[PDB]
Amino acid sequence: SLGPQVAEGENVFGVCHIFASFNDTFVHVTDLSGKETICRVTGGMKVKADRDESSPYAAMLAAQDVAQRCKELGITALHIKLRATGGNRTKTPGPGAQSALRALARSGMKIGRIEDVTPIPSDSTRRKGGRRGRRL
């Protein structure tokens, strides 16, 4: 909780690994090496209703929370590493990614470079569900 970077106009970049699944949203700030966790606020930590952990609401709450927790330790700006479920499963960022990314940029943190790191296979194992899929 003491950055030796003079706050003249020198930007201390973290890197937030936004993992937006379709039943949870992880907002997670990390150091520039990618090793040492600074702050990790999940979607279902804020709201205690199991249906809507992966909401634009709970994503926005956790994003504002980490943004306040992150400017305490003295990380000025952030790099974005957005990802979906990936592998066999869906490759679209969940409904929380947009509210999370927006809200923690609304909350005074500056955005560096945005990129996608969804684990896509060159080719994978068999997918969950039958040959006829999920009949519902």
């Binding site: 869906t90 679209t92 955005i111 470079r113 945005i114 899929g133």
Partner: protein, 101 residues
């Protein structure tokens, strides 16, 4: 009775085409029968653009697009309203519908 001259697929001179998993379900459908769509969206939506445009350190950073290739089974394609039923004569028109703006 025979509905479609090509049997609802792009198989002509094979006999077998490796099956593929529907993105919505996980139903195995033939690769050539599957309704394919290519989705190119920005990582941030429309109104969040101006928020992240001015709350970014870099002047004139063209933020990237997410590129997704979606396969659907015929069931999911009709349900999610990607494809619909057509007139008996208007079924024949293969020309993809107009995208201008």
């Amino acid at each position: 009775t025979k509905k479609r001259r090509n049997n609802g697929r792009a198989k002509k001179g094979r006999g077998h085409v490796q099956p593929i998993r529907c993105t919505n379900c996980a139903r195995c459908v033939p690769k050539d029968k599957a309704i394919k769509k290519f989705v190119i969206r920005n990582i941030v939506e429309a109104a969040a653009v101006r928020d992240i445009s001015e709350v970014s350190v870099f002047d004139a950073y063209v933020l990237p697009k997410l590129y997704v290739k979606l396969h659907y089974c015929v069931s999911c394609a009709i349900h999610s309203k990607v494809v619909r039923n057509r007139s008996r004569e208007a079924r024949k028109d293969r020309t993809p519908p107009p995208r201008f703006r």
